[PDB]
Short mmCIF file of all heavy atoms in Angstrom, two decimals:
data_model
loop_
_atom_site.label_atom_id
_atom_site.label_comp_id
_atom_site.label_asym_id
_atom_site.label_seq_id
_atom_site.Cartn_x
_atom_site.Cartn_y
_atom_site.Cartn_z
N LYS A 6 0.83 -1.20 0.00
CA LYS A 6 0.00 0.00 0.00
C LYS A 6 0.87 1.25 0.00
O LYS A 6 0.46 2.30 0.51
CB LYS A 6 -0.98 -0.02 1.18
CG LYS A 6 -2.02 -1.13 1.06
CD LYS A 6 -2.50 -1.62 2.42
CE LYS A 6 -3.36 -0.58 3.13
NZ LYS A 6 -3.91 -1.10 4.42
N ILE A 7 2.07 1.15 -0.58
CA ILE A 7 3.00 2.28 -0.64
C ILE A 7 2.31 3.51 -1.22
O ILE A 7 2.43 4.62 -0.69
CB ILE A 7 4.23 1.89 -1.48
CG1 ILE A 7 5.08 0.86 -0.74
CG2 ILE A 7 5.05 3.12 -1.82
CD1 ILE A 7 6.05 0.13 -1.65
N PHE A 8 1.59 3.33 -2.33
CA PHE A 8 1.01 4.44 -3.07
C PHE A 8 -0.46 4.67 -2.74
O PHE A 8 -1.19 5.22 -3.57
CB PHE A 8 1.18 4.23 -4.57
CG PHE A 8 2.61 4.13 -5.01
CD1 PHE A 8 3.10 2.96 -5.56
CD2 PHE A 8 3.46 5.22 -4.88
CE1 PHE A 8 4.42 2.87 -5.97
CE2 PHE A 8 4.78 5.13 -5.29
CZ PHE A 8 5.26 3.96 -5.84
N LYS A 9 -0.92 4.26 -1.56
CA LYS A 9 -2.30 4.52 -1.19
C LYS A 9 -2.55 6.02 -1.19
O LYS A 9 -1.69 6.82 -0.80
CB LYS A 9 -2.62 3.92 0.18
CG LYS A 9 -2.07 4.69 1.37
CD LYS A 9 -2.63 4.15 2.69
CE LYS A 9 -4.15 4.28 2.75
NZ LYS A 9 -4.71 3.82 4.05
N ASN A 10 -3.73 6.42 -1.67
CA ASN A 10 -4.13 7.82 -1.78
C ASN A 10 -3.34 8.59 -2.82
O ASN A 10 -3.38 9.83 -2.84
CB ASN A 10 -4.06 8.54 -0.43
CG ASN A 10 -4.90 7.86 0.64
OD1 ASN A 10 -4.40 7.54 1.72
ND2 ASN A 10 -6.17 7.64 0.34
N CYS A 11 -2.62 7.90 -3.70
CA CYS A 11 -1.92 8.54 -4.81
C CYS A 11 -2.69 8.28 -6.10
O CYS A 11 -3.03 7.13 -6.41
CB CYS A 11 -0.49 8.01 -4.94
SG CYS A 11 0.61 8.41 -3.56
N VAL A 12 -2.98 9.35 -6.83
CA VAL A 12 -3.50 9.29 -8.19
C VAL A 12 -2.45 9.89 -9.11
O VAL A 12 -2.22 11.11 -9.08
CB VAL A 12 -4.84 10.04 -8.31
CG1 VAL A 12 -5.42 9.87 -9.70
CG2 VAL A 12 -5.81 9.55 -7.25
N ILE A 13 -1.82 9.06 -9.94
CA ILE A 13 -0.66 9.47 -10.73
C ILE A 13 -1.06 9.62 -12.19
O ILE A 13 -1.84 8.82 -12.73
CB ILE A 13 0.50 8.48 -10.57
CG1 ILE A 13 1.18 8.69 -9.21
CG2 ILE A 13 1.51 8.65 -11.69
CD1 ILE A 13 1.49 7.41 -8.48
N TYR A 14 -0.53 10.65 -12.84
CA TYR A 14 -0.63 10.83 -14.28
C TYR A 14 0.78 10.94 -14.84
O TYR A 14 1.57 11.77 -14.39
CB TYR A 14 -1.44 12.08 -14.65
CG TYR A 14 -1.37 12.38 -16.13
CD1 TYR A 14 -2.04 11.59 -17.04
CD2 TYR A 14 -0.63 13.45 -16.60
CE1 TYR A 14 -1.98 11.86 -18.40
CE2 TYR A 14 -0.56 13.73 -17.96
CZ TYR A 14 -1.24 12.92 -18.85
OH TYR A 14 -1.18 13.19 -20.20
N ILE A 15 1.09 10.10 -15.82
CA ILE A 15 2.42 10.05 -16.42
C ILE A 15 2.38 10.87 -17.70
O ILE A 15 1.60 10.58 -18.61
CB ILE A 15 2.85 8.61 -16.71
CG1 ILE A 15 2.88 7.79 -15.42
CG2 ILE A 15 4.21 8.59 -17.39
CD1 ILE A 15 3.19 6.33 -15.63
N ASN A 16 3.23 11.89 -17.78
CA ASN A 16 3.29 12.78 -18.93
C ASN A 16 4.56 12.49 -19.72
O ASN A 16 5.67 12.68 -19.20
CB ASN A 16 3.26 14.24 -18.49
CG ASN A 16 3.29 15.20 -19.67
OD1 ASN A 16 2.24 15.57 -20.21
ND2 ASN A 16 4.49 15.59 -20.08
N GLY A 17 4.40 12.05 -20.96
CA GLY A 17 5.52 11.91 -21.86
C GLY A 17 6.24 10.59 -21.73
O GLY A 17 5.79 9.64 -21.09
N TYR A 18 7.40 10.54 -22.38
CA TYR A 18 8.22 9.34 -22.38
C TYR A 18 8.84 9.13 -21.01
O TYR A 18 9.28 10.08 -20.36
CB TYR A 18 9.33 9.47 -23.42
CG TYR A 18 10.35 8.36 -23.38
CD1 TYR A 18 10.19 7.22 -24.16
CD2 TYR A 18 11.48 8.45 -22.58
CE1 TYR A 18 11.12 6.20 -24.13
CE2 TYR A 18 12.41 7.43 -22.54
CZ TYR A 18 12.23 6.31 -23.32
OH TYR A 18 13.16 5.29 -23.29
N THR A 19 8.88 7.87 -20.57
CA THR A 19 9.53 7.51 -19.32
C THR A 19 10.19 6.15 -19.47
O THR A 19 9.82 5.33 -20.31
CB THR A 19 8.55 7.45 -18.13
OG1 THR A 19 7.52 6.49 -18.39
CG2 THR A 19 7.91 8.81 -17.88
N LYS A 20 11.19 5.93 -18.62
CA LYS A 20 11.86 4.64 -18.49
C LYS A 20 12.01 4.40 -16.99
O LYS A 20 12.73 5.17 -16.31
CB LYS A 20 13.23 4.66 -19.17
CG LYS A 20 13.85 3.28 -19.33
CD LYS A 20 13.08 2.42 -20.31
CE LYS A 20 13.46 0.95 -20.21
NZ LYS A 20 12.26 0.08 -20.33
N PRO A 21 11.38 3.38 -16.42
CA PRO A 21 10.57 2.42 -17.20
C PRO A 21 9.38 3.07 -17.88
O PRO A 21 8.99 4.21 -17.61
CB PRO A 21 10.10 1.42 -16.14
CG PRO A 21 11.07 1.55 -15.01
CD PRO A 21 11.50 2.98 -15.00
N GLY A 22 8.76 2.28 -18.78
CA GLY A 22 7.69 2.77 -19.62
C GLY A 22 6.36 2.90 -18.90
O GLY A 22 6.18 2.48 -17.76
N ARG A 23 5.41 3.49 -19.63
CA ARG A 23 4.10 3.81 -19.06
C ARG A 23 3.43 2.58 -18.46
O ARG A 23 3.00 2.60 -17.30
CB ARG A 23 3.22 4.42 -20.16
CG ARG A 23 1.76 4.58 -19.80
CD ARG A 23 0.95 4.95 -21.05
NE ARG A 23 1.32 4.11 -22.19
CZ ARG A 23 0.81 2.90 -22.44
NH1 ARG A 23 -0.11 2.37 -21.64
NH2 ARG A 23 1.22 2.23 -23.51
N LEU A 24 3.31 1.50 -19.24
CA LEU A 24 2.58 0.33 -18.75
C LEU A 24 3.26 -0.28 -17.53
O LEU A 24 2.59 -0.70 -16.59
CB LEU A 24 2.43 -0.70 -19.87
CG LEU A 24 1.66 -1.97 -19.48
CD1 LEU A 24 0.28 -1.62 -18.92
CD2 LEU A 24 1.53 -2.90 -20.67
N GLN A 25 4.59 -0.33 -17.54
CA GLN A 25 5.31 -0.90 -16.40
C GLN A 25 5.10 -0.07 -15.14
O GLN A 25 4.93 -0.62 -14.05
CB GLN A 25 6.80 -1.01 -16.74
CG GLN A 25 7.58 -1.92 -15.83
CD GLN A 25 9.06 -1.93 -16.14
OE1 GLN A 25 9.46 -1.76 -17.30
NE2 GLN A 25 9.88 -2.13 -15.12
N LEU A 26 5.10 1.26 -15.27
CA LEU A 26 4.85 2.12 -14.12
C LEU A 26 3.41 2.01 -13.64
O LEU A 26 3.15 2.01 -12.43
CB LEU A 26 5.19 3.57 -14.47
CG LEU A 26 6.67 3.88 -14.71
CD1 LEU A 26 6.84 5.28 -15.26
CD2 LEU A 26 7.47 3.71 -13.42
N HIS A 27 2.46 1.93 -14.58
CA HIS A 27 1.06 1.75 -14.20
C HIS A 27 0.87 0.47 -13.38
O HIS A 27 0.16 0.47 -12.37
CB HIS A 27 0.18 1.72 -15.44
CG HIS A 27 -0.07 3.07 -16.04
ND1 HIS A 27 -0.68 3.24 -17.27
CD2 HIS A 27 0.21 4.32 -15.59
CE1 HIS A 27 -0.77 4.53 -17.54
NE2 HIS A 27 -0.23 5.20 -16.54
N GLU A 28 1.49 -0.62 -13.82
CA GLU A 28 1.41 -1.87 -13.06
C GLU A 28 1.99 -1.71 -11.66
O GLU A 28 1.39 -2.14 -10.67
CB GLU A 28 2.13 -2.99 -13.81
CG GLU A 28 1.45 -3.40 -15.11
CD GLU A 28 2.21 -4.49 -15.83
OE1 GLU A 28 3.28 -4.90 -15.34
OE2 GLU A 28 1.73 -4.94 -16.90
N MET A 29 3.16 -1.08 -11.56
CA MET A 29 3.76 -0.85 -10.25
C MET A 29 2.85 -0.02 -9.36
O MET A 29 2.69 -0.32 -8.16
CB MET A 29 5.11 -0.15 -10.42
CG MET A 29 6.15 -0.99 -11.14
SD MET A 29 7.69 -0.11 -11.44
CE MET A 29 8.38 -0.12 -9.79
N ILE A 30 2.23 1.02 -9.91
CA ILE A 30 1.35 1.87 -9.12
C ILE A 30 0.17 1.06 -8.59
O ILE A 30 -0.16 1.11 -7.40
CB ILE A 30 0.89 3.08 -9.96
CG1 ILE A 30 2.08 4.00 -10.23
CG2 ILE A 30 -0.21 3.85 -9.24
CD1 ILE A 30 1.80 5.06 -11.27
#
């Protein structure tokens, strides 16, 4: 529950990539 109460929006290119970060979140 590290990210409880967090709503994240990823803007632009990232590494790791969007889908990988979404899964982690």
Side-chain angles (χ1 to χ4, degrees):
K6 294 151 70 176
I7 290 162
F8 299 116
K9 76 171 299 183
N10 304 126
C11 294
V12 185
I13 284 136
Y14 171 72
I15 300 176
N16 182 89
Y18 173 91
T19 60
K20 192 68 195 140
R23 170 190 46 85
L24 181 55
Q25 196 184 329
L26 292 171
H27 283 171
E28 292 179 358
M29 295 176 75
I30 292 168

